[PDB]
Amino acid sequence: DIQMTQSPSSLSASVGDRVTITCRASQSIDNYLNWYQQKPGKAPKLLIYAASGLQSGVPSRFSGSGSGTEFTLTVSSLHPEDFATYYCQQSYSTLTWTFGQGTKVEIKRTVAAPSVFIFPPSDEQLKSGTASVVCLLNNFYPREAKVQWKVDNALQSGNSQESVTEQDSKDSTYSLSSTLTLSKADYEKHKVYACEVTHQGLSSPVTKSFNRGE
Amino acid sequence: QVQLQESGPRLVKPSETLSLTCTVSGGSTSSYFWNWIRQPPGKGLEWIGYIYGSGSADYNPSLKSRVTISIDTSKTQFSLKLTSVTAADTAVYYCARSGFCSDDACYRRGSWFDPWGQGTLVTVSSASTKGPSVFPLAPSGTAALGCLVKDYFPEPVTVSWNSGALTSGVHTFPAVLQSSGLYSLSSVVTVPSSSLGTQTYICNVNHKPSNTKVDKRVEPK
Amino acid sequence: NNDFHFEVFNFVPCSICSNNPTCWAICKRI
C-alpha cells in the first residue's frame, strides 16, 4: 500500500498569484505521479502525467516537478477559471493506484455586495398545505453573509435552510438562497414577511419584504 | 475520440447489488485497461478495480470481497457489480481507461486515467423514488425569477432554462435535504425587466431516477 | 494468435517506444 499526503487541504489566492500544491508519497514511486483537476459536478481531468508531462490541451501555466517521494503542482499565474479541486495520483503500485485527499483552490477577489430579492410562496404551493418563502442573494464576495427572517417584525429561528453555489468560473462570486418554510395555517396568521441581509459589501443592511396577498 | 459512458439504476436498496455498465464508443475493450472509480459526496476518489483482455480482473482490497468486474462479448462494454451495499456505497461512480498500448502489448504500470466517463450518482437508501413538484418563483433594470423544485428522492435533478438556450446568469443551487427525507432545490435567473410580458421563461426539470420531466413557465403574478 | 499481450507488473521497456512520445515518457531501460 502507498498513501499520498497532499497539502494544503484548502487555499485561497488572488488572480495572478503563483500557487503551489505539494504531494508526498509514503514510499518512492519514481516519476509515476499524475495530477488531475476536478471542477464541481464533473469528472477529474488529467493535467500532468508522469510527474512533469503537460497533457495536450492544458495551458503551460500548469507544471509538475519532483521524483521519488516529493512532488509539486504549480500554477504560475492563477486565473479565475482555475477554481477547482486538484488531486495527485500514484501509478507505481502493481495493484492499488491511490489519490491524495485533494486541494480545493478558491479565488480571492474584491468585495462585491449582493443584490437581494424576495419571493412569496406560489398559490399552487399553498393548496398543498406548505408555504416556502425564498430569499436570494446574487453574485457576492466574500462567502460570508447573514440572512435574518422577520415575520411581522418577529425574528425567526429554526425554520430556514440555506444553500450556496460554487464560486463562479468567470467573476469568482457566490450566490445564496435562504428558504423559510411555514405551514399554510401559520403563514396565513401573519402579514409582513421580510428578509434582512448583512454582508461586508453593504454599509447598512438591505431588507426586502412583501405583504401577504398584495 | 474514445468516449465512455456509465449507465444503470440510480437507487439501490441496502443489502442489494449495485450494477453499472460502461459503454465504450470509438474503441474496443480488447486492448487497454478498463477501470471503475468512485467518489462519495464531498469526499475524495477511490479506485475500485480494473479488467482487461479476455476478462482478467483485480480489485482494491477494501472492496475485493464484494466487487466483480466483467467484460462483454460485444467487446464494447464492461460492467461493475457490487454486493451487500450500505449507505457508505452512495457515491458518484466513474469508468475510465488506463494503460499504454503498442502494436501488440499493453502495459498498465506508470500510466494514468484517461479518458473518463461522465460519472453517475448512485444512492443506497430504503426510501422510495419520488418525483418533484415544481413551483414558480415569480418576478416582483433587472428582475430575478426561478423555479422551486420540491420534495423529490433521490438526487439528482437537472434544471435548464428555455431548452438550454438560456444559461447566462442561471444559478441552480445545491439541493437541501429536508426533515421529511426529501430534497428541495431552487434554480434562478436574472432577466431584463422589460421582457416579462412577451418573452417566455420556462424551467425544464428532469428527474431521471423517477422518469419525471416538467416544463414550467414562470410569469409575473 | 491475434490477442494482445498484457503486462501489469513490468514497466514499459524503452526498446518498444518507436517514436511514440507517450511510451518514452514512462519507459525504463529494461
Author numbering:
A (entry chain B): 1 to 95, 95A, 96 to 213
B (entry chain A): 1 to 82, 82A, 82B, 82C, 83 to 100, 100A, 100B, 100C, ...
C (entry chain C): 160 to 189
Copy out sentences from the published article reporting this entry, exactly as the authors wrote them.
To characterize the interaction of antibody CB002.5 with the central conserved region of RSV G, we determined the crystal structure of Fab CB002.5 in complex with the G peptide to 2.1 Å resolution. The complex crystallized in space group C2 and the asymmetric unit contained four copies of the complex, with the only notable discrepancy between the complexes being the elbow angle between the variable and constant domains of the Fab. Although the G peptide is 45 residues in length (Asn153–Lys197), the electron density allowed for accurate placement of only 30 residues (Asn160–Ile189), indicating that the N- and C-termini of the G peptide exhibit structural flexibility and that the epitope of Fab CB002.5 is likely confined within these 30 residues. Fab CB002.5 buries 1,067 Å2 of surface area on the G peptide, with the majority of the interface formed between the CB002.5 heavy chain and the strictly conserved residues of the RSV G central region. The CDR H3 of Fab CB002.5 forms a disulfide-stabilized β-hairpin, which in turn makes main-chain hydrogen bonds with the strictly conserved G residues 164-HFEVF-168 to form a parallel β-strand interaction. In addition, conserved residues of RSV G from the same region, including Phe163, Phe165, Val167, and Phe170, have hydrophobic side chains that fill pockets on the surface of Fab CB002.5. The cystine noose lies at the interface of the heavy and light chains of Fab CB002.5, facilitating the interaction of hydrophobic side chains of the G peptide, such as Val171 and Ile175, with the CDR H3. In addition, the cystine noose folds the protein back upon itself to form a hairpin, bringing the residues immediately C-terminal to the cystine noose into close proximity with the N-terminal residues and into contact with the Fab, forming a conformation-dependent epitope.
RSV infection produces two forms of the G protein: the first is a full-length membrane-bound form that mediates viral attachment; the second is a secreted form (sG) that arises due to translation initiation at an AUG codon in the transmembrane domain. The central conserved region contains thirteen amino acids that are strictly conserved across all RSV strains, and these residues partially overlap with a cystine noose containing a 1–4, 2–3 disulfide topology, with the residues spanning the third and fourth cysteines (Cys182–Cys186) forming a CX3C motif. The cystine noose is thought to mediate RSV attachment to human airway epithelial cells during natural infection by interaction with CX3CR1. To gain insight into the modes of antibody recognition of the central conserved region of G, we isolated and characterized a panel of human monoclonal antibodies that target G. We identified two antibodies, CB002.5 and CB017.5, that bind with high affinity to sG, potently inhibit infection of human bronchial epithelial cells (HBECs) in the absence of complement, and protect cotton rats from severe RSV disease.
